[PDB]
Amino acid sequence: SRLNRESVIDAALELLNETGIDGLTTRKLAQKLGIEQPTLYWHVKNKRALLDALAVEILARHHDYSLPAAGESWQSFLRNNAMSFRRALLRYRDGAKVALGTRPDEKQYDTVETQLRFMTENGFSLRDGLYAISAVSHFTLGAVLEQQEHTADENLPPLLREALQIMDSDDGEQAFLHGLESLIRGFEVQLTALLQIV
Amino acid sequence: SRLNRESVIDAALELLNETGIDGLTTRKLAQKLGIEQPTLYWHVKNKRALLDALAVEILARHHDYSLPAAGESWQSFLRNNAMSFRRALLRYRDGAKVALGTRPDEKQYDTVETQLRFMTENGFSLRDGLYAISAVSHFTLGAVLEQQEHTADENLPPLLREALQIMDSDDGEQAFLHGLESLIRGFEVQLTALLQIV
Numbered sequence: 001s002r003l004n005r006e007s008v009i010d011a012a013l014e015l016l017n018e019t020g021i022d023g024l025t026t027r028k029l030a031q032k033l034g035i036e037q038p039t040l041y042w043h044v045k046n047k048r049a050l051l052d053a054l055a056v057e058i059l060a061r062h063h064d065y066s067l068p069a070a071g072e073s074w075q076s077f078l079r080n081n082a083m084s085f086r087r088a089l090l091r092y093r094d095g096a097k098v099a100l101g102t103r104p105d106e107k108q109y110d111t112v113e114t115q116l117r118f119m120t121e122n123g124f125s126l127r128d129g130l131y132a133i134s135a136v137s138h139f140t141l142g143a144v145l146e147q148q149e150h151t152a153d154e155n156l157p158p159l160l161r162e163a164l165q166i167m168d169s170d171d172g173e174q175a176f177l178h179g180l181e182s183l184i185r186g187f188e189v190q191l192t193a194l195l196q197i198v
Numbered sequence: 199s200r201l202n203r204e205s206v207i208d209a210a211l212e213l214l215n216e217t218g219i220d221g222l223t224t225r226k227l228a229q230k231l232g233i234e235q236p237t238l239y240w241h242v243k244n245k246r247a248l249l250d251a252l253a254v255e256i257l258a259r260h261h262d263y264s265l266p267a268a269g270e271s272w273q274s275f276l277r278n279n280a281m282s283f284r285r286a287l288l289r290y291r292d293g294a295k296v297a298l299g300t301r302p303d304e305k306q307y308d309t310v311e312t313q314l315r316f317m318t319e320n321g322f323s324l325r326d327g328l329y330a331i332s333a334v335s336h337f338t339l340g341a342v343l344e345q346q347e348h349t350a351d352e353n354l355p356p357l358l359r360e361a362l363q364i365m366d367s368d369d370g371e372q373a374f375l376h377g378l379e380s381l382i383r384g385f386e387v388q389l390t391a392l393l394q395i396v
């Protein structure tokens with residue numbers, strides 16, 4: 001079929017959904033695109049190369065809250081950013097595993113530069129703003145992995161039994177949204193304190 | 199060599215370190231133990247079975263702060279628990295990927311039951327205490343994955359350039375320890391508030 005970048009990414013995202021990350025292969029991608037393995041090699045060198053591009057394109061297609069509104073608070077921006085990051089990552093099977101260990105792409109520079117600039121213009125040192133960004137990113141990544149990977153007893157002590165009932169009664173959105181408010185409020189306590197002991 | 203549970207786990211943890219999770223196989227485990235694949239099958243059915251046991255044994259060997267001291271605060275317990283969880287997970291390559299999506303083992307029941315009980319005896323509803331436990335777990339899991347997986351440009355805009363310098367200047371312990379204080383303080387704000395608007 002068509003082998004421009006857009007079409008190779010479309011097929012690679014379908015395959016990721018049917019098979020997951022550990023069963024995504026250049027052999028199986030060649031099969032789905034209707035082509036021979038050496039035809040594929042011209043366009044895509046290895047699994048790593050593909051994985052890097054998939055991390056970028058999932059957010060381009062599905063991460064709609066990358067940038068703060070005019071007048072929006074930093075707290076609100078982190079809330080709306082995190083929910084949109086979580087949605088984009090749940091959209092494909094092992095989506096969060098695809099995003100793991102990547103660094104901003106050249107095509108994300110203007111966007112992530114605007115994000116860091118926004119945090120500094122709201123009173124964070126670059127280092128403290130980055131610590132807040134990284135903590136929201138890591139918490140969200142952790143929550144999506146545990147949910148997604150989870151999809152992949154008679155003598156339960158009583159509080160564990162009820163806790164497992166609580167977890168199994170929801171997809172994880174409730175625990176996620178509660179955790180995010182705790183994180184955002186902790187950053188606020190830290191920022192407002194300045195040089196006071198807190 | 200010896201094929202009792204302890205010895206199969208020793209070998210599987212070595213192999214995990216040389217090869218990572220995605221390259222851990224029953225074929226390669228059989229090779230390292232000096233045995234044929236059907237000899238292995240009697241002791242270990244599949245990769246999933248192995249992965250479940252490895253998650254348990256990494257914490258048994260290396261997770262030394264499972265339980266609070268006499269008189270210890272809940273804040274202190276979560277701090278000391280999280281640092282010990284992080285250490286145990288960094289001890290092997292893709293350690294955090296091994297722990298992902300598992301639920302307490304029968305051999306962890308008394309331990310995790312004591313943990314949930316401790317949170318309730320410090321004023322948390324079971325649901326709110328579980329939300330705090332899950333948030334600390336997810337943040338830690340996220341931070342270790344990004345660090346571990348990361349191990350697996352000339353026109354950098356200026357704040358991203360300095361932020362990447364900041365991340366590359368440390369193994370991730372600094373960002374982790376800062377994030378954990380923000381999370382613990384947010385739970386405290388939430389718990390103390392009770393039915394007040396906060």
Ligand SMILES: C[C@H]1c2cccc(O)c2C(=O)C2=C(O)[C@]3(O)C(=O)C(C(N)=O)=C(O)[C@@H](N(C)C)[C@@H]3[C@@H](O)[C@@H]21
Nearest residue numbers: 059066081085102103104108112115133137361362
């Ligand atoms: C500033 C970025 C950064 C800086 C230095 C080292 C890094 O590893 C990063 C990132 O990895 C970021 C992301 O991945 C984003 O998810 C990211 O790239 C991104 C985006 N493309 O819109 C986000 O929404 C961000 N968000 C918190 C989930 C986040 C970025 O802010 C950071």
Ligand SMILES: C[C@H]1c2cccc(O)c2C(=O)C2=C(O)[C@]3(O)C(=O)C(C(N)=O)=C(O)[C@@H](N(C)C)[C@@H]3[C@@H](O)[C@@H]21
Nearest residue numbers: 163164257264279283300301302306310313331335
């Ligand atoms: C209470 C446990 C729980 C309850 C209900 C559903 C669950 O999925 C869990 C866990 O997965 C827990 C862990 O994995 C621990 O890491 C876990 O098993 C554990 C331990 N074996 O010592 C910990 O130290 C805990 N810690 C926060 C990292 C944590 C457990 O508290 C929870």
Ligand SMILES: [Cl-]
Nearest residue numbers: 001033034035
């Ligand atoms: Cl074709």
Ligand SMILES: [Cl-]
Nearest residue numbers: 001002003007
């Ligand atoms: Cl075509």
Ligand SMILES: [Cl-]
Nearest residue numbers: 001002003004
């Ligand atoms: Cl083409």
Ligand SMILES: [Cl-]
Nearest residue numbers: 004005006007
């Ligand atoms: Cl294209």
Ligand SMILES: [Cl-]
Nearest residue numbers: 025026027047
């Ligand atoms: Cl491959």
Ligand SMILES: [Cl-]
Nearest residue numbers: 199231232233
């Ligand atoms: Cl032998």
Ligand SMILES: [Cl-]
Nearest residue numbers: 199200201205
């Ligand atoms: Cl022997």
Ligand SMILES: [Cl-]
Nearest residue numbers: 199200201202
């Ligand atoms: Cl034996």
Ligand SMILES: [Cl-]
Nearest residue numbers: 202203204205
């Ligand atoms: Cl044994």
Ligand SMILES: [Cl-]
Nearest residue numbers: 223224225245
């Ligand atoms: Cl296997």
Ligand SMILES: [Mg+2]
Nearest residue numbers: 102103104137
């Ligand atoms: Mg990232």
Ligand SMILES: [Mg+2]
Nearest residue numbers: 300301302335
């Ligand atoms: Mg767990």
